[PDB]
Amino acid sequence: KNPKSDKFKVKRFHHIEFWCGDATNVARRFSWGLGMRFSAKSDLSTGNMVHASYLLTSGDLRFLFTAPYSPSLSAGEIKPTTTASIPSFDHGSCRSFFSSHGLGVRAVAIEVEDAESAFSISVANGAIPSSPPIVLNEAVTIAEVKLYGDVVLRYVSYKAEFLPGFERVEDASSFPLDYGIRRLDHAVGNVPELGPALTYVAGFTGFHQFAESGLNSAVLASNDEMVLLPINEPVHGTKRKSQIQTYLEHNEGAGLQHLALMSEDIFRTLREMRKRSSIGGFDFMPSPPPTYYQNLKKRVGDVLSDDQIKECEELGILVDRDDQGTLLQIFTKPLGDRPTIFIEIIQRVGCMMYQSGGCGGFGKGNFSELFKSIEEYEK
Amino acid sequence: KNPKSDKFKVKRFHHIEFWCGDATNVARRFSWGLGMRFSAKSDLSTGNMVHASYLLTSGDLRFLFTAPYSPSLSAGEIKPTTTASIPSFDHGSCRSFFSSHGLGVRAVAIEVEDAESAFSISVANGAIPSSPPIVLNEAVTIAEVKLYGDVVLRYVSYKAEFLPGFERVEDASSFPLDYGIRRLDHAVGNVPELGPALTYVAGFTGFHQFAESGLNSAVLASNDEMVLLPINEPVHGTKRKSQIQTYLEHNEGAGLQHLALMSEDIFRTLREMRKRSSIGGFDFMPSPPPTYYQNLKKRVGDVLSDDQIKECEELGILVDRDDQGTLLQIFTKPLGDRPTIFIEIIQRVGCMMYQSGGCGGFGKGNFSELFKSIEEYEK
Ligand SMILES: Cc1c(C(=O)C2=C(O)CCCC2=O)ccc2nc(C)n(-c3ccccc3)c(=O)c12
Ligand SMILES: Cc1c(C(=O)C2=C(O)CCCC2=O)ccc2nc(C)n(-c3ccccc3)c(=O)c12
Ligand SMILES: [Co+2]
Ligand SMILES: [Co+2]
Questions:
Q1: How far is B273 from chain A (nearest CA, A)?
Q2: Considering Cα of B31, then B232, then B146, then B161, what sign does the dihedral take?
Q3: Could B173 and A278 be called an inter-chain contact, meaning their C-beta atoms sit closer than 8 Å?
Q4: Are B24 and A177 a contacting pair at CB < 8 A?
Q5: Crossing angle, helix A194-205 and helix A115-124, to 10 degrees?
């Protein structure tokens, strides 16, 4: 059931912004690890005396990495005379965020029809304002409201190239890496209490609800279910400590838990990412046991060949299924020092009309099944 | 002239420690960019609730990358009960350093015969104490005094594996990268005033002095001239602004300007590093013009073949010469967001007895010659 209750017109995920201590090193690591190209910059070389921002792209996926310069470089500026390309940026906020949470996502940005309208309607419906709408070079409008913790939901709307004041990266500095990643599928938050978090976000967006170990979760979705925002809370008092609780402890509270990146070919993406794990890229979760794949035949043997199923076995891919589609997924180890944010690589099969959003669900069946397999691998 | 006036027994450079916001991403970037292997760790997985520290090695070169965790993880600890493996570490100092300076070197560590003696003698001769000697697992002693800015000179001495509490990295996670880098040749500081900086450091170490555009410099050297510590000050009032002054402005004062890394084969090192520049590694300075290499024949045509000289031309290597040896060198672009720290790759030829330290000098002749070539390339 989809009541299509969005209080304003939402299009697609637009970008994800990481707040960093040093944007250059994080951006270069992520570029090599994920196969994303350096596409745009805003920094000292573009006249920005406030922050260094580097944009990586793979298909429609946009990762932005931002770090503050010394405040002394811009001490004479005021907001009317700022050289920042992202006017919501604040040195103090950025340093406070990074010292509190470590490397992580500051902004989940969605493209809307009218960012000023989205901001006004959101705050009229309970959103906590974070940065008011500002029109950039009469071309782009950006506004921000609080999402959870110190993460903001950023609205961006275009009258008619990332943002004004960004420059395209020199082609010599822009190597055309591509491991198959194409778009952001969903972005997941961890909170202490799911109920109040859901009521708040659904309250100001009109997003609707989309349809034992560790967590309770629920998913908020835009009208066409292309913007997907799951939220988790911990379940306390279990034998094994909730990884949601561990997240909240090491992150100093609520924040973004994972980004799920859709691949057009998850087998190629994982081959390429795993090649680079020990040479600067990303590590993956420990693989499921053979019993997990010895049980895939009964569960998805009509969607994947046995050659493809053991090709999932090589790469350690998990598979889950809903009533409408099938889901291939795998999780990285945490992206930085703290056991907080990680990445999920995903590919969805089914639900063709284009593919409808959330085809196959989010893999919650893989909790029971992966442990069931581990225990029956003890055998 | 070498008076051999060291006030305590100094052996070799031991390690360089970077203070980071996220040690994982900087370490992974540096590993791929420089061809250094992950060799040791101290972090949550080793029981360290205070800081994440990752050690990279190439030959005798040791780069350590350290970042703080949330203070809440260790709020119950006191110094007697600390889980930190580097007891001089302080959350507040580390965050203050990184917010002030950005990514950069906190510690230049040298191995000595007796770190407690070196500390006591140093402070008796004017060194500003930073961290008192502490014996680690009855095996290693570490002490720190101020060097310049917020950089410390760290003394480490061993009774008889990096530091206690560090663990060897799993071989699966330890890919054997090697681009030919073998040891730290020198470590260079930028200060506002050279005179007082030299008097201070030479005062407490007994290091001796080793023997127009932008700077004045001088080099302090240990008895066998294997520990080399050049220091630069800006020269003001020139047409082109001093890069030393630019450093001091963007760094918020004095600090480490560059690390010079000796290669056993600078041609292989540069081939490998340049292959990776646009795929997560390091960028290099713009190459000298053909006139620079069209003038190398007259200057070093008796040390390098014409095939090797144009092989310097391919890689953009600079060459300089003293009265005793020859020096091949090249400089990276800054290692992070700010125009502050960079790396030099070096190889020295001559002065065989082993090779004596500083063979060929430090390339100061390449200032005049590189511009002379650029202007006569205008031709
Ligand atoms: C992270 C995740 C998801 C997931 O994306 C997710 C949810 O957890 C809540 C709904 C929204 C959403 O996107 C689904 C299934 C998973 N299954 C397992 C076995 N693990 C896992 C747990 C320990 C160790 C290795 C993997 C996961 O992390 C895992
Ligand atoms: C950095 C450096 C050194 C050097 O290592 C160094 C000194 O500067 C002082 C003595 C101790 C020491 O180790 C030597 C020669 C150099 N020559 C040039 C042309 N440039 C340079 C300047 C602009 C743009 C591209 C290169 C340098 O940076 C440069
Ligand atoms: Co997910
Ligand atoms: Co040098």
A1: 14
A2: positive
A3: yes
A4: no
A5: 130
Structure tokens at B123: 């402070």
Strand-strand pairing, B325-331 and A208-209: unpaired
CB A90 within 8 A of CB A64: no
Cα separation, B73 vs A246, in Å, equals: 11
For residue B220, give the nearest of B234, B235, B199, B193 by alpha carbon.
B199
- Nearest atom in ligand 1 to the alpha carbon of residue A366 is 17
What residues are in contact with ligand 2 under a 6 Å CB criterion?
Answer: B 186, 188, 217, 230, 232, 258, 260, 285, 331, 344, 362-364, 366-367, 370
Q: What is the 3-state secondary structure (H, E, C) of chain A?
A: CCCCCCCCCEEEEEEEEEECCCHHHHHHHHHHHHCCEEEEEECHHHCCCCEEEEEEEECCEEEEEEEECCHHHHCCCCHHHCCCCCCCCCHHHHHHHHHHHCCEEEEEEEEECCHHHHHHHHHHCCCCEEEEEEEECCCEEEEEEEEECCEEEEEEEECCCCCCCCEECCHHHCCCCCCCEEEEEEEEEECCCHHHHHHHHHHHHCCEECCCCCEEEEEEECCCCCCEEEEEEECCCCCCCCHHHHHHHHHCCCEEEEEEEEECCHHHHHHHHHHCCCCCCCCECCCCCHHHHHCHHHHHCCCCCHHHHHHHHHHCCEEEECCCEEEEEEEECCCCCCCCCEEEEEEEEECECCECCCCCCCCCHHHHHHHHHHHHHHC
How far, in Å, CA of B319 to CA of B325, rounded? 11
Q: Do A336 and B44 lie within an 8 Å CB cutoff?
A: no
Residues A274 and A294 sit within 8 Å (Cβ to Cβ): no
Q: Residue A31: list chain B partners with CB under 8 A.
A: 279-280
> Which residue from B337, B150, B21, B247 is spatially nearest to A50, judged by alpha carbons?
B337
User: Do residues B289 and B141 touch, judged by C-beta distance below 8 A?
Assistant: no
A23 with B337: Cβ contact below 8 A = yes
Of B43, B252, B337, the CB nearest to A67: B337
Q: How far apart are CA B41 and CA B166, in angstroms?
A: 5
Segment (H or E) for B337 = none
Rounded to 5°, the CA angle A253-A259-A260 comes to 145
10 Å Cβ neighbour count for B78? 7
Q: Report which protein residue has its CA nearest ligand 2's atom 9.
A: B217
Task: Characterize the bridge pairing of strands A51-58 and A61-68.
Answer: antiparallel
**Model resolution, angstroms:** 1.6
Structure tokens at B307: 């095939």
Q: Ligand 1 mean position to A215 CA, how many Å?
A: 10
Q: How many angstroms is it from A317 CA to the middle of ligand 1?
A: 12
Q: H/E element holding B17?
A: strand B10-19
- Nearest-CA neighbor of B38 among B173, B165, B167? B173
Asked whether the CA dihedral B7, B11, B12, B14 is positive or negative, the reply is negative
Chain position carrying tokens 């502050």: B340
Smallest CA–CA distance from B65 into chain A, residue: A337
Please tell me which of the candidates B21, B175, B278 has its beta carbon nearest to residue A98: B21
Q: Taking CB atoms and an 8 Å cutoff, what residues of chain B touch A172?
A: 278
Q: Do A337 and B22 touch (CB under 8 A)?
A: yes
Q: How far apart are CA A237 and CA A290, in angstroms?
A: 31
- Our answer on whether the CB atom of A372 is closer than 6 Å to any ligand 1 atom is no
Relative to beta strand B151-158, strand B104-112 is: parallel
Q: Which domains does chain A have, with CATH numbers?
A: 10-173 (3.10.180.10), 181-378 (3.10.180.10)
